[PDB]
Design a protein around this nucleic acid. Structure first.
Lengths: 158, 63, 22, 172, 129, 145
RNA sequence: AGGUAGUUGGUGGGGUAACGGCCCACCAAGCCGAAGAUCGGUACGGGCCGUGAGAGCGGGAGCCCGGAGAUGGACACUGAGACAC
RNA sequence: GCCCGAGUGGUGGCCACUAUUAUUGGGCCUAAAGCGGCCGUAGCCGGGCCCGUAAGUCCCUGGCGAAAUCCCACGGCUCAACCGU
RNA sequence: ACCCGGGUAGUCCUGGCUGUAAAGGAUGCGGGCUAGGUGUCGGGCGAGCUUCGAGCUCGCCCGGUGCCGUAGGGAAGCCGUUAAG
RNA sequence: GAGCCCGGGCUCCGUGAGGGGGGAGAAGUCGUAACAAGGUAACCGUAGGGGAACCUACGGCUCGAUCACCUCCU
RNA sequence: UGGAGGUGAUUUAAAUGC
């Protein structure tokens, strides 16, 4: 359940709906759902938060269950709805949010350098990126010619 | 909980009927965020801990 | 004890290391 | 080699058994006892290992080790590799030349017997023998006798008298 | 993480056993465990099980008769020839009687005794007795 | 995990582990190098002849006092000074200075002089190629030169 | 703990019974290394052997099998064959 | 008086005992022994479900790992060692 | 020397080096499984109270932090859902 | 194309004044360090000083002290 | 009933013995 990583503390036990086919007391068409998604990605919100607002407002807990089957290759869900349109960021949001944050740290340290702890999370966030990079290369969202560095983090954000 | 005897969240669904426009919205008993009415611009619920605290009197049918 | 020994070892080392340095 | 001595040689319980055995069969040295223990050990060891393995391995191996024990006579008409392990150092010692000479009534007593075969006063088959160890088969039992001997070339050797006063065979 | 999910099933199942609960719950679930419980049931060691496949995971609720003493996976999971069986026979099992050294095989999965009757072998998976 | 990697391909780690940890047996290390064979003269051997430089008597150990009979002998090819413990009561007598004296060890080659004697690693068997236990008994042979 | 300069490879050639950097002319800059190379120690290698319930550990003796040597070190003839107890 | 017996004992070496080298089959709070803590490279180790290959893996056949030594049988030498089949 | 009266380095700040400890819980990390009780910290939930603020309390749950203790382990002390099972 | 030689460098074997330590011998001397709060608790890393055991400073730890005084916990 | 801290602490009691 847990993983105490850079911690000793058991992780949240947040858990999914054990629903495997979707509510029908809730009702939306493949067309209506697709609109809602596109509207929200147009705002500047991102896929986790897109799935969040749809849940809280339109009452759809996860997209996969509602959508698929409509092309049963795999489950149809937010960003796989986005890529077919061309609205997808070529960097996975995972890797993006990560790097995004990271560049902010550096600026703090820039002005403030006497910071143990703040220094120590720079080291703790990079090394999650590294990993997240490493595997993607092999999966293929990021070319094999790339390698990660703090000038090649300040170029991707700008 | 019931993690080895099938974990099911605490959740449910409830039909909320707006008091300012009569607009019928489906709402997750736990609002994580501010849910906005789609034909008033109002706030139905506000996100605090556990179950979103419902702002004032808004009608409710419990599913 | 280990006080003893540490300084004895240190003195041995120094004095001898003095004799090597010289 | 051809001997064994258990991990601890001076142990009382091991030594008692022997000395009682030593008079019983009238050995000359302990080594002799040992010969039969160590011989017994090998049959057991093998009998056991064969029964254990997968039943498809050429059964000939079993047959062969049951054949010899039958022929030698230790095993009578029993069919299990488990009876073999039910032998003891006494049974082997019953099978010797020495033992079998006293038994049939060719000798007064086993101590006497030790004299006879050495000087060639016991014939087996057509041959004489010098080694009282000699393993005597079942088929081989019927062919112990006198012919060119000091016990039987006449009927007035006191030798004949010495064997007659007793007349008792049996386990030695 | 986990690895050897089977093993973490089995090990519960036994420590489950040793207490003398009534039935078990194994949160991670699978073919390996599924299949193994299947073969286990086939020999009879266990009573009945239901797995419920939740969108999360398979879970096995298992009924405990009382039979099982000890049943464990193999660590590097060694390959074992059908000639070497007897060695691995004497070691792991408690005696000639029991015969569920559960191996994995060309034919499928079997115990030790069901393996020997066919005549086929391979890498070890787990044990049961 | 109780130490060891267990895994099909790992073995090499195993294979080096053992060997790494073997060298904590002094005895094993010592032989596999050959420190037993280099140090405590002999060049390893069962025994060694040597010329009796003199006769010396030394003291006994801690609960003890008694004059042990010891020789000083020089091994001839070894060319090393060895002080040595002589078996028997009278003995020191039958050994003339500058007779040949063959020498052995006594009671584990480890270094261990027997409990009484401090130093003495070794034993003497012989005076002019006839031994000491033969010279404790009067009849058997008696010494020359 | 870094080593390597006929050194790794390429082209063409010599020599040899013959392939081959074996040797050599020209061209290239490789080749090998922490899955431990290089260097240092020690040591003929194998069949076996000793021991040990087994797993294992130690060992290369007669004998057989294969290689190396003949006071140390180099060198050719003569012969199918030797660089020749 | 006990042992063993043409042997018996001394020194030395190796193996066993020694799960005191832990694969089988060891530990590591206080007995020896956790790195003061983290990161991630090399390595080892890996949730479920379907399909291909069959590299490992198992099964069968086939080429082959000299003789000797070993183990078992029978046969030979008075017996066995030893040798022959 | 313990006790008392003076006293430099240092103790403070900034930049750098140095890298040690009974740096302890003398207890490497990760996952799963295995009676319980109680106190406590923070988060959730159903109520009663209310000063209308989770302020005062009851119980289930999640994360952490102590103590006591069943089965088991341990040589024993002890450990025992914060394992040394 | 060997052995052979020559000049230098590097390494190894036989052997040497002198020099270091160990396990000891326990009848000389100095002291009381630790083990009892050892009579100033003890250890610990670091630094200085003392003939010695050792003392002191600073930080840590209890494998820490004996009541007393105060505080919590089944 | 058994466990953990925080600080008074007591100098009126002397070194050694194979």
């Amino acid at each position: 359940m847990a993983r105490m990583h850079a911690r000793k503390r058991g992780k949240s036990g947040s858990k999914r709906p054990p629903r495997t086919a979707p509510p029908i007391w809730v009702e939306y068409t493949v067309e209506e759902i697709e609109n809602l998604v596109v509207k929200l990605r147009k705002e500047g919100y991102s896929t986790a938060m897109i799935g969040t607002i749809l849940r809280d407002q339109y009452g759809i807990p996860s997209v996969k269950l509602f959508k698929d089957p409509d092309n049963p290759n795999r489950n149809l869900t937010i960003t796989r709805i986005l890529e077919k349109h061309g609205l997808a960021p070529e960097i996975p949001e995972d890797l993006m949010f990560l790097i995004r944050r990271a560049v902010n740290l550096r600026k703090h340290l820039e002005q403030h350098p006497k910071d143990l702890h703040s220094m120590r999370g720079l080291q703790l966030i990079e090394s999650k990126i590294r990993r997240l990079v490493k595997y993607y290369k092999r999966k293929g969202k990021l070319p094999k010619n790339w390698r990660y560095d703090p000038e090649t983090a300040k170029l991707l954000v700008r | 909980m019931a993690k080895p005897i099938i974990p099911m969240p605490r959740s449910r669904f409830l039909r909320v009927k707006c008091i300012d426009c009569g607009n019928e919205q489906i709402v997750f008993s736990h609002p994580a965020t501010k849910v906005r009415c789609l034909i008033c611009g109002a706030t139905l619920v506000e996100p605090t801990g556990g179950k979103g605290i419902v702002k004032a009197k808004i009608l409710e049918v419990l599913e | 004890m280990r006080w003893k020994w540490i300084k004895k070892r240190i003195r041995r080392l120094k004095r001898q290391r003095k004799k090597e340095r010289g | 080699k051809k001997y064994e001595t258990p991990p601890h040689p001076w142990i009382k319980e091991r030594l008692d058994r022997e000395r009682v055995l030593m008079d019983k069969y009238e050995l000359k040295n302990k080594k002799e006892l040992w010969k039969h223990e160590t011989q017994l050990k090998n049959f057991r060891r093998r009998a056991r290992r064969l029964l254990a393995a997968r039943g498809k391995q050429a059964e000939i191996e079993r047959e062969q080790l049951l054949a010899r024990l039958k022929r030698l006579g230790l095993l009578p008409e029993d069919a299990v590799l488990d009876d073999v392990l039910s032998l003891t150092i006494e049974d082997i010692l019953e099978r010797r030349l020495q033992t079998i000479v006293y038994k049939k009534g060719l000798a007064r007593t086993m101590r006497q017997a030790r004299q006879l075969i050495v000087h060639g006063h016991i014939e087996v088959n057509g041959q004489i023998i010098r080694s009282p160890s000699y393993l005597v088969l079942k088929e081989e039992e019927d062919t112990i006798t006198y012919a060119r001997t000091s016990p039987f070339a006449n009927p007035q050797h006191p030798e004949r008298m010495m064997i007659e006063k007793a007349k008792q065979g049996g386990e030695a | 993480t986990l690895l050897d999910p089977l093993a973490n099933a089995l090990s519960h199942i036994t420590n489950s056993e040793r207490v003398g609960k009534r039935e078990v719950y194994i949160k991670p679930a699978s073919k390996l465990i599924g299949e193994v419980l299947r073969v286990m049931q086939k020999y009879g060691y266990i009573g009945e099980f239901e797995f419920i496949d939740d969108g999360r995971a398979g879970v096995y609720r298992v009924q405990l008769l009382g039979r099982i003493n000890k049943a464990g996976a193999i660590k590097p999971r060694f390959p074992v020839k059908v000639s070497e069986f007897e060695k691995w026979e004497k070691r792991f099992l408690p005696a000639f009687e029991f015969g569920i050294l559960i191996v994995s095989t060309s034919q499928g999965v079997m115990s030790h005794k069901e393996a020997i009757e066919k005549g086929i072998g391979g890498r070890l998976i787990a044990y049961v007795y | 995990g109780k130490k060891a990697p267990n895994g099909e391909f790992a073995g090499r780690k195993l294979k080096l582990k053992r060997k790494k940890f073997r060298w904590s047996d002094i005895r094993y290390k010592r032989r596999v190098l050959r420190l037993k064979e280099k140090s405590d003269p002999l060049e390893g051997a069962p025994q060694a002849r040597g010329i009796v430089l003199e006769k010396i008597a030394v003291e006994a150990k801690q609960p003890n006092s008694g004059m042990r009979k010891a020789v000083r002998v020089q091994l001839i090819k070894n060319g090393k000074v060895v002080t040595a413990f002589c078996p028997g009561d009278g003995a020191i007598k039958f050994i003339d200075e500058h007779d040949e004296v063959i020498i052995e060890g006594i009671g584990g080659p480890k270094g261990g002089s027997m409990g009484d004697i401090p130093g003495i690693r070794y034993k003497v068997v012989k005076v002019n190629r006839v031994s000491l236990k033969e010279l404790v008994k009067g009849r058997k042979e008696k010494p020359r030169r």
